[PDB]
Amino acid sequence: MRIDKLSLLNFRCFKQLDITFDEHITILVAPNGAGKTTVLDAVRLALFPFIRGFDASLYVKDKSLAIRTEDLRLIYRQEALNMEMSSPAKITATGEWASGKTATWMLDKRGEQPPHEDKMAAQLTRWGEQLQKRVREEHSLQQVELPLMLYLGTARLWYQERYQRLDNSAFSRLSGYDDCLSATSNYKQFEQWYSWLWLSYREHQITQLESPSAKLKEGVRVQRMKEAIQAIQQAINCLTQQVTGWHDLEYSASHNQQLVMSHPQYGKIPLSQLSDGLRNAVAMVADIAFRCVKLNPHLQNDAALKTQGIVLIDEVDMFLHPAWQQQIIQSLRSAFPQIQFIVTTHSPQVLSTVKRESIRLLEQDENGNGKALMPLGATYGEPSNDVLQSVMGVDPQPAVKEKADLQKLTGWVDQGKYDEPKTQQLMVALEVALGEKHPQLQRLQRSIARQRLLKG
Amino acid sequence: MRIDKLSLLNFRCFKQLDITFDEHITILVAPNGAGKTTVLDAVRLALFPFIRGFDASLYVKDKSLAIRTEDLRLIYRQEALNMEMSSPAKITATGEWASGKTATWMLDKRGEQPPHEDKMAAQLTRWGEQLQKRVREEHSLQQVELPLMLYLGTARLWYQRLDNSAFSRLSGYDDCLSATSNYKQFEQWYSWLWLSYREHQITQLESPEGVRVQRMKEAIQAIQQAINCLTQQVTGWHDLEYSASHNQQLVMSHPQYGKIPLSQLSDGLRNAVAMVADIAFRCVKLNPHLQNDAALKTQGIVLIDEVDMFLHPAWQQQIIQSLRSAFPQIQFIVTTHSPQVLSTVKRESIRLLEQDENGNGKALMPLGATYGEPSNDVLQSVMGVDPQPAVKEKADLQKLTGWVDQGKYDEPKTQQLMVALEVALGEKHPQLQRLQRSIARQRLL
Amino acid sequence: MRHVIKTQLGTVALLTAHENPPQDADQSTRRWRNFRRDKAAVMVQLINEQYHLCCYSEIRSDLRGLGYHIEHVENKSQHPERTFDYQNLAASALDSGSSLKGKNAFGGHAQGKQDVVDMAKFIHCHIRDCSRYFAYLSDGRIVPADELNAQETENAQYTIDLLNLNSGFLQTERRNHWEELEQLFDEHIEKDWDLQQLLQLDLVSTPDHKLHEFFSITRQFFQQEAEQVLQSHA
Numbered sequence A: 001m002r003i004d005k006l007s008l009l010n011f012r013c014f015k016q017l018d019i020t021f022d023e024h025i026t027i028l029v030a031p032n033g034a035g036k037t038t039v040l041d042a043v044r045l046a047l048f049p050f051i052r053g054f055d056a057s058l059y060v061k062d063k064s065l066a067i068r069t070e071d072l073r074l075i076y077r078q079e080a081l082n083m084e085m086s087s088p089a090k091i092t093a094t095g096e097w098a099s100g101k102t103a104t105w106m107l108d109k110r111g112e113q114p115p116h117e118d119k120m121a122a123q124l125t126r127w128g129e130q131l132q133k134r135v136r137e138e139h140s141l142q143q144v145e146l147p148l149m150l151y152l153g154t155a156r157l158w159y160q161e162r163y164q165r166l167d168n169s170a171f172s173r174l175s176g177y178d179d180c181l182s183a184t185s186n187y188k189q190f191e192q193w194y195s196w197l198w199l200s201y202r203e204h205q206i207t208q209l210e211s212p213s214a215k216l217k218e219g220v221r222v223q224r225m226k227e228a229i230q231a232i233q234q235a236i237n238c239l240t241q242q243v244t245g246w247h248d249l250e251y252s253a254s255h256n257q258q259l260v261m262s263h264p265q266y267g268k269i270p271l272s273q274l275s276d277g278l279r280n281a282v283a284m285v286a287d288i289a290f291r292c293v294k295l296n297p298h299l300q301n302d303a304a305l306k307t308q309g310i311v312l313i314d315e316v317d318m319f320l321h322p323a324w325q326q327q328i329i330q331s332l333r334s335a336f337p338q339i340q341f342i343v344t345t346h347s348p349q350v351l352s353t354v355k356r357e358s359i360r361l362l363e364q365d366e367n368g369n370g371k372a373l374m375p376l377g378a379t380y381g382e383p384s385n386d387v388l389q390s391v392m393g394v395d396p397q398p399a400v401k402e403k404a405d406l407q408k409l410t411g412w413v414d415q416g417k418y419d420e421p422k423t424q425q426l427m428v429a430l431e432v433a434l435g436e437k438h439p440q441l442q443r444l445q446r447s448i449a450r451q452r453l454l455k456g
Numbered sequence B: 001m002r003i004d005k006l007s008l009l010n011f012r013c014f015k016q017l018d019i020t021f022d023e024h025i026t027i028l029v030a031p032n033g034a035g036k037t038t039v040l041d042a043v044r045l046a047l048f049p050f051i052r053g054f055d056a057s058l059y060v061k062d063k064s065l066a067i068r069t070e071d072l073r074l075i076y077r078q079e080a081l082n083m084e085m086s087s088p089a090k091i092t093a094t095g096e097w098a099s100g101k102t103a104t105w106m107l108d109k110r111g112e113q114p115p116h117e118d119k120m121a122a123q124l125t126r127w128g129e130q131l132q133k134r135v136r137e138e139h140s141l142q143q144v145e146l147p148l149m150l151y152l153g154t155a156r157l158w159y160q161r162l163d164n165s166a167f168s169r170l171s172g173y174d175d176c177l178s179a180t181s182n183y184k185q186f187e188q189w190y191s192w193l194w195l196s197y198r199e200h201q202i203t204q205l206e207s208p209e210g211v212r213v214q215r216m217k218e219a220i221q222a223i224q225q226a227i228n229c230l231t232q233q234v235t236g237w238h239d240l241e242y243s244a245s246h247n248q249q250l251v252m253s254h255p256q257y258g259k260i261p262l263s264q265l266s267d268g269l270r271n272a273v274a275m276v277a278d279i280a281f282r283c284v285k286l287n288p289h290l291q292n293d294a295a296l297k298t299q300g301i302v303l304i305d306e307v308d309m310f311l312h313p314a315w316q317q318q319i320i321q322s323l324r325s326a327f328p329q330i331q332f333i334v335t336t337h338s339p340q341v342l343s344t345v346k347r348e349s350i351r352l353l354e355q356d357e358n359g360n361g362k363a364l365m366p367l368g369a370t371y372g373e374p375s376n377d378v379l380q381s382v383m384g385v386d387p388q389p390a391v392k393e394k395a396d397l398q399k400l401t402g403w404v405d406q407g408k409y410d411e412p413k414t415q416q417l418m419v420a421l422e423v424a425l426g427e428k429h430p431q432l433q434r435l436q437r438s439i440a441r442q443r444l445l
Numbered sequence C: 001m002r003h004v005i006k007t008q009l010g011t012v013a014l015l016t017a018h019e020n021p022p023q024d025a026d027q028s029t030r031r032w033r034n035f036r037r038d039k040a041a042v043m044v045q046l047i048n049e050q051y052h053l054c055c056y057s058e059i060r061s062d063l064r065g066l067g068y069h070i071e072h073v074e075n076k077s078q079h080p081e082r083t084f085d086y087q088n089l090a091a092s093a094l095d096s097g098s099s100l101k102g103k104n105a106f107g108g109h110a111q112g113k114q115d116v117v118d119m120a121k122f123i124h125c126h127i128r129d130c131s132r133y134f135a136y137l138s139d140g141r142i143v144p145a146d147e148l149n150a151q152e153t154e155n156a157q158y159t160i161d162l163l164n165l166n167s168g169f170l171q172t173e174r175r176n177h178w179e180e181l182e183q184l185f186d187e188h189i190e191k192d193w194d195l196q197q198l199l200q201l202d203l204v205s206t207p208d209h210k211l212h213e214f215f216s217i218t219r220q221f222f223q224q225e226a227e228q229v230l231q232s233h234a
């Protein structure tokens, strides 16, 4: 499944907006307001009719997975006592469901009336229901492959501490959609499933060792367990190993029944005792990896490498340092190379690692009209300061007390008047205030030397 | 209350460390896994004996406020492929409790035994208890000053009386070592305060009081001043208020734009406002006798982990100076990995944390300068990170640049590499265009 | 800026369209909308006469893939009688029709230039002595020239702000150009090269009517050598 375009009308922040998406990776950037969160929420709302067809609906009473009266647009006017709503609110999505199956579907809400959807939005539920039907007829030789939907918000690490099988069964396969668009943390689901997986692998290994007469039947259960473990570990290594050195997430009973990681010089340490960035990244990658494993068991090792779907990440680079921020996007594109990523960030280090066609700068005007444009200049492989000034509009020189004097000195020196006593006094004052090795002062000295050389 | 030096022995990841702190602001800088949170936690543990002297925390049996078995250091024996625990874990602190009272105290835990404090760490509890006793004085005409203790971690987003009495005064130490600050609660209690003030203010217009009214006015003045120190220079916003006319919302004023609601801003700036306002309100509660100068004359220690969370690079350059201007008598200890934050402080206020293969730690001043320095220079020098990312074709571009510089553009291999790079990067790549202009330039001669 | 010299009357369709000038905003808008068929020839002539440089920023929009659009020096909503006057038309970057008009737009698409223009203070490329109003700095900025009256400086600053010529993108590009010029200076000093053979590549046009971008910065960087090159070959 893939989404190519989205249009909003009278939604939370935008009076109207049209945004297209790149095929593999799209990055949203916004200096002011909460436009990025609005776009992510709109995409999440447009993706729900599919999940509705798998019995995965508001059975836990998730009221956030539909347009609410709190999502409509209210205009406050200072000269009037009355405040009205803007109706209807609409979300239109264009994209592809299966190979060659293009579609456009719309959701709308009018005032306080219940939300309504058109006929293509209902066909999107019918497609999920027929996928479920094909999954439940397991007495077949053909294989059906399920897509992936996932949402990872900023509250994915808040209360990690609050809260099994692996086979080709409908109950086991459809557990990969459980809480897949939820706004809360999903870490204990993974921890329990991974613990069961490791314990079953070990117990079946010893059972096979003590009586291998079941080689042809129980010897392929342990192989499936091993392949699942390997897929998950490879996906996690692709993100952690090179930058941090930690690798091979495991479950250990001798460490107080905890998940542990290994380091060449630091040995084995529980994950809960590691740094914030490492825990955040491990949770992020594990989510996607085991959902992929559970959805598509018949792809033993390539479950993560051969699965298709859409993943939404808010603040992809949380708690990561600049050296780690220069490698996150490529690591994600290497671990899951068939998935469509839509992420948000405000880091120039991340932005320098993508082409300008994968970036969307969001802006509004006074009346709510929205725009999602591309950068005017190149960003792929450029220095961080170039991206920071050209794209985000921030001067790399900070506004310290001496900045204005530096600007005046530059303006005087570059325009030929550098032998005047006032200019020299300013030069010496700035040299003592900022040091003689400041790059701008050095280039001003170069300019003075060049101007002296020309006059000859 | 001021801490000058800290020493750790066999703590989480440090075999040994000794770190000295600056009087007003200290920033710990390092990559992930270096030990910034470790130092902040050691400092937070060294301060708990004082907080334990008050009844607001004499009941606090939290296990995170003592040395645990998980805090002792583990060594990896590769030949034996095992983890060996090293004991004991020690924390030693030095500093000033009151004017002219220098002290050194220590805490230690050995193996699985309970943690144990030394003789001088009990005198800190005794001093806290004496302060609590002096607060509960009725006819006293000599003022009592209370210091501010506060810890704001990475989980500070997960989640009144205002009298001149002992209960209200000591309510300022409520969950101070595990404090939380998100904008929902801040909006709630600020709105309550403003509603009470508006009631008492209208009552004067109707029929043209005392302690409860002036205590409400002074708190609002102090909090507004503190937030002004944060927002009034980058933009024109000032004097955050609650307005019923503007559909019962919190609003700010701009000389050219009028009133704007606070709820139309980004989460990062709202959380920064909430943090500053919470610090100011705690300062006001602790020391009523300072009236509207409570935030400008209170002393204490504030610890902040990841001081620049969810902040745009424009607000990362004006956060340390805002804190220094709002609370000039407080000692700040913050952590970060952002170079925009570091481009605005002197090198005397920075500590870089490093280790060796055996676990001996160091916390040193940067060698180069950082004040008023471009972000790329700080990134390269302080952090050692090249501002230019290592994309796939970076090595090829460098090799082609080297070849063209020495004057070998006419060789077939150079042309083949140029064609490959053109098809990969494209024909409008700035570096390729520069190389082509250079090639054309070194012709016609 | 650079002074643009016009030496072409225009096109037959443009001349005929100017026989009956529009006399209000609505007529000008409607007829400009209907004129879309013959815009290509006018734009081709305009781009050729400018040596492929933007009328305000001196960039090579073709080499960056941003395009051109026809710009009215004086807004046709202000004085619609000149909607078809060839003397009131130039070519600006950022063709009209995802990177497009917005807050950060510069040139004809800049926010200020779209609303209102005061022609008294506006310095543009069709004024013979515009180049002396501006100076280009080493950090990417553009400023008014020192040898300007207290009245000319106000006009220069007003024009700089109206066209948003100090945006981050333009500043970055100008800074990179300055760095490259420094590189070239050092190179010719080291190699004992001549500082006129190389400059003819940058300051002298080509048979296909093309100029290197940022003409003014190059001319101002080489103070007297650039003038010698220009006088020799122009």
Ligand SMILES: Nc1ncnc2c1ncn2[C@@H]1O[C@H](COP(=O)(O)OP(=O)(O)OP(=O)(O)O)[C@@H](O)[C@H]1O
Pocket (backbone or CB within 6 Å): A266, A269, A273, A274, A275, A276, A277, B011, B012, B013, B030, B031, B032, B033, B034, B035, B036, B037, B038, B039, B070, B071, B072, B073, B074, B075, B305, B335
């Ligand atoms: N008992 C222990 N023995 C040895 N190493 C330990 C122990 N406990 C934790 N560590 C290591 O200490 C490091 C944790 O450091 P810490 O989390 O303070 O660093 P940080 O990235 O600077 O901080 P933060 O991201 O929380 O701001 C990790 O390498 C962890 O493996």
